[PDB]
Amino acid sequence: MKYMVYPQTFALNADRWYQYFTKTVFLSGLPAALRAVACDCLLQEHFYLRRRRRVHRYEESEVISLPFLDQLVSTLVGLLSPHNPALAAAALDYRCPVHFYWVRGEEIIPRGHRRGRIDDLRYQIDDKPNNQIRISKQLAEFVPLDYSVPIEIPTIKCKPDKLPLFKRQYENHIFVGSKTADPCCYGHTQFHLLPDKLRRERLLRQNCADQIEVVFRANAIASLFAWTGAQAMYQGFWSEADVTRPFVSQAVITDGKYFSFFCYQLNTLALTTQADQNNPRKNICWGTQSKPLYETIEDNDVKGFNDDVLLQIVHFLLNRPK
Amino acid sequence: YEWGVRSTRKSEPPPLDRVYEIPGLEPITFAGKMHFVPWLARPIFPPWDRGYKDPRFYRSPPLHEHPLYKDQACYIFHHRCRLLEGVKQALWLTKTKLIEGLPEKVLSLVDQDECVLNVISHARLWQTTEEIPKRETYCPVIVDNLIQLCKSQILKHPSLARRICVQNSTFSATWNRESLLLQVRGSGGARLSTKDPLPTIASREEIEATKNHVLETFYPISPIIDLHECNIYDVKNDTGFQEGYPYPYPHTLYLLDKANLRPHRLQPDQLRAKMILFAFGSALAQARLLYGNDAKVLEQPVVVQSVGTDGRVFHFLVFQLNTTDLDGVKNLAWVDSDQLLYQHFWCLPVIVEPVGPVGFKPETFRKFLALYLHGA
Amino acid sequence: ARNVVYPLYRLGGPQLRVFRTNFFIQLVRPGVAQPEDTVQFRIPMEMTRVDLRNYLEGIYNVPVAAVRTRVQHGSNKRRDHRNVRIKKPDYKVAYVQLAHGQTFTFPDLFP
Amino acid sequence: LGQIYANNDKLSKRLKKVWKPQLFEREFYSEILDKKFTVTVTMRTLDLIDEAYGLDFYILKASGEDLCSKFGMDLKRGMLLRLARQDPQLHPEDPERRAAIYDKYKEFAIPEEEAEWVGLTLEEAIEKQRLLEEKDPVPLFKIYVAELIQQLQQQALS
Amino acid sequence: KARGNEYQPSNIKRKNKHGWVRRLSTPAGVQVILRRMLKGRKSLSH
Amino acid sequence: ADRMSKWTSKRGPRSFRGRKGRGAKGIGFLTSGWRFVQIKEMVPEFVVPDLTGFKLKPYVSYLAPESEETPLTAAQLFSEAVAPAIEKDGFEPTQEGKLFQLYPRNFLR
Amino acid sequence: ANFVSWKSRTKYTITPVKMRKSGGRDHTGRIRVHGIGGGHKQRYRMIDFLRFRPEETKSGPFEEKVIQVRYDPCRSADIALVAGGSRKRWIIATENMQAGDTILNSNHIGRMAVAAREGDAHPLGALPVGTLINNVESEPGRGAQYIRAAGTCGVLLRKVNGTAIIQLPSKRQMQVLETCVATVGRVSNVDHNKRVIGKAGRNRWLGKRPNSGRWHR
RNA sequence: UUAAUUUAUUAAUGCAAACAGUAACCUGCAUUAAAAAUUUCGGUUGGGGCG
RNA sequence: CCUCCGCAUAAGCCUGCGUCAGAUACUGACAAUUAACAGCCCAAUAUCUACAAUCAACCAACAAGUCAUUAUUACCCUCACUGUCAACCCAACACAGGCAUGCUCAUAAGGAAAGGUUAAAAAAAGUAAAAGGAACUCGGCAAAUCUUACCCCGCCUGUUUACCAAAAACAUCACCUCUAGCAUCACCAGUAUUAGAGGCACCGCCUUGGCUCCACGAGGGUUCAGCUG
RNA sequence: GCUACCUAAGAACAGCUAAAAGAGCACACCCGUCUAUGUAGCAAAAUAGUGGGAAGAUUUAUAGGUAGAGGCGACAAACCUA
RNA sequence: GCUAAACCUAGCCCCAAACCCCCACCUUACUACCAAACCUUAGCCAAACCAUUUACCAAAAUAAAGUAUAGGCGAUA
Ligand SMILES: [Mg+2]
Ligand SMILES: [Mg+2]
Ligand SMILES: [Mg+2]
Ligand SMILES: [Mg+2]
Ligand SMILES: [Mg+2]
Ligand SMILES: [Mg+2]
Ligand SMILES: [Mg+2]
Ligand SMILES: [Mg+2]
Ligand SMILES: [Mg+2]
Ligand SMILES: [Mg+2]
Ligand SMILES: [Mg+2]
Ligand SMILES: [Mg+2]
Ligand SMILES: [Mg+2]
Ligand SMILES: [Mg+2]
Ligand SMILES: [Mg+2]
Ligand SMILES: [Mg+2]
Ligand SMILES: [Mg+2]
Ligand SMILES: [Mg+2]
Ligand SMILES: [Mg+2]
C-alpha cells in the first residue's frame, strides 16, 4: 500500500508536504521572429481556428492550452535547434507518463492483525506532463553536490493522509518517459499545464491569494522529483547506492496564460529511514513567481505580451550538456 | 419479408370504452383522480408540449421543418465514409487523372538514420510502461517525430520557418458532377500550412493532355455508393480559419488512423480515396476562398499534398487542382502507395530473432522529407 | 434546511434562499491529531460541503478554504436486556481547512 | 358453468361442462343517436329486438339486469339524455323529422337530473359526485370582508 | 461434498427475489405483505 | 442477512453503494463525462441579517411579566389588517405572478 | 420469461446484427426444442431475399456487381455481398459466382426464354423449361422461401398458361404463378453434405448439445 | 396395461347454427382416436406364494 | 522452527483485539474510514458502419468472431452525492471445510506443531531391519521398486447416482428409418445438402449384419520379471 | 444465492515436449480411483498420502430464466436450499 | 446447609352494550426532481373398499319436523 502522490493537486500546503515527502529545500529565484510565432500559435488556438462544436469553459484548458503548448514547444525546438545542437538529437514526448516510486520513512501499523509493526511508508507519483524533452547526455548541475542551504526542510507532524492523500496498491512503476533501453534517457525540460479543476479563476472563486503559487510549486516539486529520480534509478543509483553526480532537470508549469519556471537538482535517493539517519544532503528546487504571458485577447491581437516569459522559455530550451 | 418483429414492435393501445362511441355523453374518467383505476374508463389526454424548453431534454424537429432544406439529394464525404471502388471512384468524383509515380521535382529534392531507427523503436518499442504499444499509441508518434525531423532539417533548408502545423482544423467544400451535389467535410489529422502558395507542378501541356484524357466508368456501381446520403447540410464552403489567417495555404494534409482493430482501420485503397477527396476538398476550398465561386479553369493551379496513416505502410499524394469547372479538363494527382518503411516489428523475441524492426527501407523516408520540402 | 420540501428549480427561476436555517452543527475536538487550520465539525446528514461552507461564510464569517466530509457509522452491536439491538446513530463529520492560514486550535474548556 | 352426468345417467361419471352462447358481429342503427354501431350480439338479442320493434325500443324498454351490459346501459343513458334534452340530434333543416323521432319515443321521458345518473356503476357515481362537489376553497379574506361589510351596514342602519 | 452452505449472499439477489417491489408486483405477493402486516411483523420484506 | 437493520448506502454492492445516498438535496445534474454541473440557483443561499447593534438576545429576564396565550387566528389577523376597511365604509386574487406563493409553496422554511 | 425476441431491428442494415441464442426456449422460459445451446457466438447478416427489389424511385430490370462471397454462420449456403445503384446488400450466392461477376435482376417476361447466365434471376416465363432454379417464392413479391439451402436445386418441369410446376428437392411438385421471380442455378457450398462432423466437440460448437428427456409427457 | 368407468379437455369427421351464392372462423349436438383422469387388485391357507 | 503463504481489490459482513474505565476480543464510555480511487452517466431526429482475433507482419484456418460515428438543432452553469474501519464472508462454533481476480515464488509479508511430566499396554503415523522374497491374500490391498505380454468389454476424449456404485452404463462422431413444402415470441429472422423424432454403434471388405481391425481405459481378469515387514 | 440446464456480458489456464490437435508429461485450478484416519468428527462426507482431467463436449465469477406430477436431466428415479 | 421452595397481580377469557379506524416511503419501499381487476373450489372425509352420493362454510328464532321429499332408495340428506 502506497500513497498516490498527485503533482497537480487541490490540497492546501501541498508544497510543504511534498518537500517533506521528497526532501527538497525550496529556494525562490533561479540558480523577434520568436515573438511572431508565439503570437501566431497563440492566436491560432484561440481565435483563428474555426470551431464547429462551440467550445465551453469546462473544456477550454484541454482544447485550447494543450495544442497551444504542443505546437509552441515543437516550433521553439525547431527554431532553436540551430542555436543549440542538443535539441537536434533530443526526444520529445507529448503526454508520456513519468512514474517514480520511492519509500520515505516508517510508520507503526495503527490497528489490525499487524498492529504495532514497522511498515515503511511508500509513495508513488503518477504524472503525465504535457510534453517533455529528453537528451542522451546529462545537463549541468547548477550547484555542486551537498550544498549548504540553511533553510531547514519542513517537519510534517501529522499522518500524510491529513493532506488528503490516499493509499492504493497497484503496480510499482519507475519510468522516465521512455523505457530503460532507450539511449535518450536523461531529460532537461518538461512542460506542464494545470488542469481545468485547478483554474486560478476557480481558486479565487475559492479563498486564496498565494495558493495559486502553491499549486504551481507542488506540481514543480513532485513532477521534477519524479523525473530526476527516475533518471537516477535508470542510471543505477537507488536508495542504498546513493547518487554520485547530482541529477537535474527543468520544468515550466503554466495554466495557458500564467507561466512559472523551475529548476531542480536531485542530490539524494537515500530517503529511507536507515539510509537517511546519517544523510546530510538534500534535493534543491529553485522556483519563480508566476507571471502572465498575455493579458487578454481581442480576437486579432494579444494585448500585454511578456518578453520576460518568452525569453525564459527560450533560455530553458537553450541550455545544453557540457 | 418485413423486418421488425411484432412482439418487439409497440402493441396497439387497448380499445377505448364505448362511451366514446355513444353520442353525445362525456365519459367519467380517472382524469379527475390523478391516477389509474381499473374501472373508470381511461381518458384521452391532450398532447402535452413543454411551453418553454429545457436544454437537457431536447427533441430535435423532424427533418422537413428545418431552416435550410435542399430538395435535391445531397452527398457528404466525411471522415468515416469508406468508398467501395476506392481510388477509381475517388478519381471519378474529383475529375482527375492518376499518375503512378511521384514527380521528378520532389525526387530531385531528395537528391540521421540513427534517429530514424530511434523513432521506429521509440514508437513501437519504448514509449509505454508495458510491452507492445498499440497502433493508437504508436502511429501519431511516428508521424509527429518525422515532422520534428523535418523541423530539424530547418538548418539545411532555412525557409521552413514560414510554415506551421495545425491540429484540429475542419473544412468543407461542395461541387457538382452530373449535376449532383457533393460535399467533403474536415479532417482531424495534421494540416501543415504555409505562408506562400505551392509551385505549379505540371505545365499547360500536361493540362491539355489530361483534357484529352478521359475518365473511367464502373457500372453498375453508381459513383455515390458509400457517400453518406445527407439531408440539410449548410452548403457554404469553408477553409476552417477566419480571414486574415497567417500561414493560409495548406501545404500538406497528414491523415492518421488510430483504432488498432482491423475492421476499424481503413483499407489501403479506401485510404487513398480518402486522401484524394480530402486533398480536393482543401484545394477547392482554397480556390473558392481566393478566386470566385464560378466554375472555370484556373490559370494558377493549386497544389496540396497528403500523407497516409498506418505508420508501417505509407501513402504519399500530390494533388494539383487546375479546374473548378466540374460537370473538359481534369485535375492531376500523383500518388504512390504502400511505401512500407519497417516491413514488420518483432517486439518480443521468438523461440534466434531479436527485438526490433525487420525489413527496413529509408527511401520512403526520403520521399517524406522531399514531400515536406517541396514548398521550399 | 432539513426535513423541508425544497422548491423545484426549472431553468431560470429565482435562487433558492433560506431564511431561518434548520441546521445545527457543533465543533468537535479531533480524535487523531489533525493539522493546524483544520476545524472538525459534526453535522446533520442532509448538509453538503457547499451548505457547510456557505453556513460558515455567512453566519459566522469564517473564511473557509476547503471542506471534506465523511459519514460515520454508529454501532448497531449493543443489545438491550431484550437481546434487541441498540443503534448508536450515524452522523456526518466535516473537516474544514481555513483560509489565509488562520490556524484554529481547539481550546481547553474544562480547565 | 356446471357439471353434467356422463351418459344422462346419475350412476356414472360427473364431469365439468361450460355452455357458451353463439356470438355475432351485427351492425345496428339507433334512430335516437343516429349512429351505426357494430356489436357482439346473439340470437336472443336479435329476437328481443324484433319483439321490441327496434334497438331503440329494446334498450329503452329493457330493464337494467335483463339488458345486462355496461355498454347497454351507456346506450340507455345516452338515448335518455338525448330525449330529456331534446337535442339538435341529426342537424337543423329537419326539425320536423326530429319531432317525429322524439314523438315516437316520447313515452320514455325522464328529467335530465335522473337521466345523467341512469346506468352508472357505483364507482362512476362516486367519481361524478365528487367532481360535482370539488369546490376550490373560498378565501377567508372574502368571507370575513363579507361579514364586516354586513356588520357595518347594520351599524349604519342603527 | 460438504453440504452446509447453500446461502451464498448477494444483496442484488436478495432484493430482486424477496424485495418489496417484487412482493408488490405480484397479487400473491401483495397478499404476502398483507399477511405479514396482519401477523404484525416488524419486517414485511427484504 | 439482517432484515431488521436499516438499509443504507454502506450496505450493498458497489453500484448500490453509489446509488443510494443520505438525504442531502441535489445541487446540480450529471452529464456525459460522468461530469457534474452544479447549478448556483439550486444551491441554497443562506440569508443572514446584520446582527450588529441589536438588543434581542437569546434569553429574557425572569422579571418579565406573565401573559396568557393567544394564537394568531386568521380572524384576528384580518381585523388588525383591515380596520382601514372600516375607515373607508390588500388581497391577492390568484398567485401566478407572485414570488413567494402561499399555497403551493415556493419558499423554504 | 422476460423474452423480448432479439430481432427488433426495422431498417435493413448491411452490417451484422448481434444474434442472441435461445437454448430452444419459449417466451415462457421453458424448453420447447430439445438439444439446443451453447454454440460459438455468431452474428446475423441481414439477407434481402426479394431478388428483384429495385431501389428507391427507380425502374425495372437492373444490374448488380458481386463484391464478396462469404461464409455465413447462420445458414448453410454462402452469402454474396452485391452492389447495384447506390445501395448494397447480401444475397444467397449460387455456386460459381466469384468476386467480380455481374448479375441481372429482371421482372420482364420476355416471350422468348432468355439466354441467361447461371447467377442472374428472372421470372419463370423468361426461364426456359426444365431449368435448374433455387431461390423460389410461392406468391409473387413475398420473397423466396424454398430451395435456398446449400447445394439444392429444384427443377422447372413445365410452363402452363398462368402457372408453372417446380420439382422441389424432396422429389416434390409445387404449383407457382407464372410471374414470380426465381434465381437460376444451384446454390453454393456443394460438397457441404459430404462433411463428416468428426467430433462431438464440433457438434457442440455448431450449437447442439446432447439432450435427454425429449418427451415431456 | 389387452382391469373398470369416462371423454369433461384437445384432434378430425358428420350434423345443425351464423355468411356468400348460383337455375374460412366461433357455438351446440354426436364419434373415433390421443393424452390422460379417477379407482381397485376377495378369502381359507400348519409363514406367504404355487396348486 | 514453520507457511501455496502474504498483500490488495471484488462479493459478503456491518464497528466485531483503537484509547480509557470497570467487572470477570466481557461490559460501558469515548474516538474513527476525509477523493484524486470507485460508483451514481449519455438531449435528440434521421443516418453510417463487407472486412476478426491470435506480437498480426509472411502465414494458418474454422467453430466465422466484442470494442466505430456523421449533418443540424438546443446546450459555458461547473466538481455535488455516496463507498472508504477491522483479526471480517458462507458453514449453529474464534469450524483442519467452501471462497472470484491481480500481484510477490518463498517471501521484504505472515505465523507456532510441545500446559508440565513420565515413557506401560492397546491404537495412529513414520523410519530401519538378518535370511527368504508373494510363501500373505478374495486379490501384490498397503508398502517397495518399476515394468512385460495376453485376453473380455466399451471404438476414442467426455458424462453419471452431491453423501456407500465412476462402470461394460449414459453421451459421442458414423449410418439407417420416420415426420414436415413453410414466414414473422421457440424451431427460425431457418427452407429437404433443412428441421424435428427414434435406433444401432468408430473403421477396411463385402449384404438380428458378419469377419478383420488400430488407438485409448483410476473398467474386469491372467502371466513374467523385479522389488519389498 | 444449493443443484440441473439455458441466456447475457466477463476471466483463467506455469514450464517442457510439440506445432493448432477434444495433443503427450505436468503445476495452478476442476474432479474424486485406491487406502488409511475419522465416526457426537475439523467436517450432518473431512483429512492424509495415491490418483484422473488440466486449450477444452474445460473450469469459473456476476446478473437473469425454467417451479412441483411441474421444472430439468450426456437416464443416475438423478437433481430442484443438508 | 447449599441448591432450592413458597407468593399475586401483570394481564387475559367469555358475554352485554355500542357500528370502528415536519420529512420519507411501489426504483433495490422507507429514495427531493422526466415522455392493469372481474372465470363452478377441490380434496381429506362417511359409505367400514370405491366409482353416483357424503352434513355445513355461501344472514335467517321456536314449532310444523327429522315430516313431505331425496337417495349405489344406502350411507346419509
Ligand atoms: Mg390371504
Ligand atoms: Mg456445520
Ligand atoms: Mg515474518
Ligand atoms: Mg499434554
Ligand atoms: Mg528383511
Ligand atoms: Mg494361504
Ligand atoms: Mg497363493
Ligand atoms: Mg498400490
Ligand atoms: Mg469408454
Ligand atoms: Mg455415490
Ligand atoms: Mg459431482
Ligand atoms: Mg465413488
Ligand atoms: Mg475416461
Ligand atoms: Mg488435452
Ligand atoms: Mg473401484
Ligand atoms: Mg448433466
Ligand atoms: Mg436405468
Ligand atoms: Mg432402475
Ligand atoms: Mg370411505
From Swiss-Prot, chain B:
The answer, when asked if Mitochondrion is one of the entry's keywords, is: yes
Q: Name one GO biological process term.
A: translation
Q: Which Pfam families does the annotation name?
A: PDCD9
**Is Cell cycle among this UniProt entry's keywords?**
no
PANTHER family per UniProt: LARGE RIBOSOMAL SUBUNIT PROTEIN ML37, MITOCHONDRIAL RIBOSOMAL PROTEIN L37
Into which family does the record put it? Answer: Belongs to the mitochondrion-specific ribosomal protein mL37 family.
Q: What is this protein called?
A: Large ribosomal subunit protein mL37
The source organism is Homo sapiens (Human)
UniProtKB/Swiss-Prot annotation, chain D:
Whom does it interact with, and what assembly results? Component of the mitochondrial large ribosomal subunit (mt-LSU). Mature mammalian 55S mitochondrial ribosomes consist of a small (28S) and a large (39S) subunit. The 28S small subunit contains a 12S ribosomal RNA (12S mt-rRNA) and 30 different proteins. The 39S large subunit contains a 16S rRNA (16S mt-rRNA), a copy of mitochondrial valine transfer RNA (mt-tRNA(Val)), which plays an integral structural role, and 52 different proteins. Interacts with OXA1L.
> What's this protein's family per the entry?
Belongs to the bacterial ribosomal protein bL28 family.
Q: Which UniProt keywords apply?
A: Mitochondrion, Ribonucleoprotein, Ribosomal protein, Transit peptide
* Compartment list: Mitochondrion
- What is noted besides the main data? Potentially represents an important therapeutic reagent for HLA-A24 patients. This antigen is recognized by tumor-infiltrating lymphocyte (TIL) 1290 in the context of HLA-A24.
Q: Which domain of life is it from?
A: Eukaryota
Q: Does the keyword Protein transport apply?
A: no
Q: Which organism is it from?
A: Homo sapiens
Example of a GO MF term = RNA binding
State the name under which the record lists this protein. Large ribosomal subunit protein bL28m
Return the GO cellular component terms, semicolon-separated: cytosol; mitochondrial inner membrane; mitochondrial large ribosomal subunit; mitochondrial ribosome; mitochondrion
Instruction: Determine if Mitochondrion is one of this entry's keywords.
Output: yes
What does the record say about tissue specificity? Found in a variety of normal tissues including spleen, testes, thymus, liver, kidney, brain, adrenal, lung and retinal tissue.
Task: State the taxonomy lineage.
Answer: Eukaryota, Metazoa, Chordata, Craniata, Vertebrata
List the range of the whole protein covered here: 87 to 244 of 256
Provide the GO biological process annotations. mitochondrial translation; translation
Curated annotation (Swiss-Prot), chain F:
Tissue distribution of the protein: Present in kidney, liver, thymus and testis, and at lower level in brain and spleen (at protein level).
Task: State the organism of origin.
Answer: Homo sapiens
Which domain of life, per UniProt?
Answer: Eukaryota
Its annotated function is as follows: Component of the mitochondrial ribosome large subunit. Also involved in apoptosis and cell cycle. Enhances p53/TP53 stability, thereby contributing to p53/TP53-induced apoptosis in response to growth-inhibitory condition. Enhances p53/TP53 translocation to the mitochondria. Has the ability to arrest the cell cycle at the G1 phase, possibly by stabilizing the CDKN1A and CDKN1B (p27Kip1) proteins.
Gene Ontology CC terms: mitochondrial inner membrane; mitochondrial large ribosomal subunit; mitochondrion; ribonucleoprotein complex
Q: How does it assemble?
A: Component of the mitochondrial large ribosomal subunit (mt-LSU). Mature mammalian 55S mitochondrial ribosomes consist of a small (28S) and a large (39S) subunit. The 28S small subunit contains a 12S ribosomal RNA (12S mt-rRNA) and 30 different proteins. The 39S large subunit contains a 16S rRNA (16S mt-rRNA), a copy of mitochondrial valine transfer RNA (mt-tRNA(Val)), which plays an integral structural role, and 52 different proteins. Interacts with BCL2.
Its localization reads: Mitochondrion
Write out the entry's keywords from A to Z. Answer: Apoptosis, Cell cycle, Mitochondrion, Ribonucleoprotein, Ribosomal protein, Transit peptide
Pfam families, alphabetically?
MRP-L27 (PF09809)
Identify the main location: mitochondrion
Is Thylakoid a UniProt keyword of this protein? no
Check the record and name the InterPro entries matching this protein. Answer: Ribosomal_mL41
Q: Does the keyword Ribosomal protein apply?
A: yes
UniProtKB/Swiss-Prot annotation, chain G:
Locate the region Disordered: 204-217
Q: Which GO terms describe its biological process?
A: mitochondrial translation
Q: What is the name of the protein in this document?
A: Large ribosomal subunit protein uL2m
Q: Which GO terms describe its cellular component?
A: mitochondrial inner membrane; mitochondrial large ribosomal subunit; mitochondrion; nucleoplasm
Query: What is the protein's quaternary organization?
Result: Component of the mitochondrial large ribosomal subunit (mt-LSU). Mature mammalian 55S mitochondrial ribosomes consist of a small (28S) and a large (39S) subunit. The 28S small subunit contains a 12S ribosomal RNA (12S mt-rRNA) and 30 different proteins. The 39S large subunit contains a 16S rRNA (16S mt-rRNA), a copy of mitochondrial valine transfer RNA (mt-tRNA(Val)), which plays an integral structural role, and 52 different proteins.
Looking at the keywords, is DNA repair present?
A: no
A single GO molecular function, which one?
A: RNA binding
List the range of the whole protein covered here.
Answer: 61 to 277 of 305
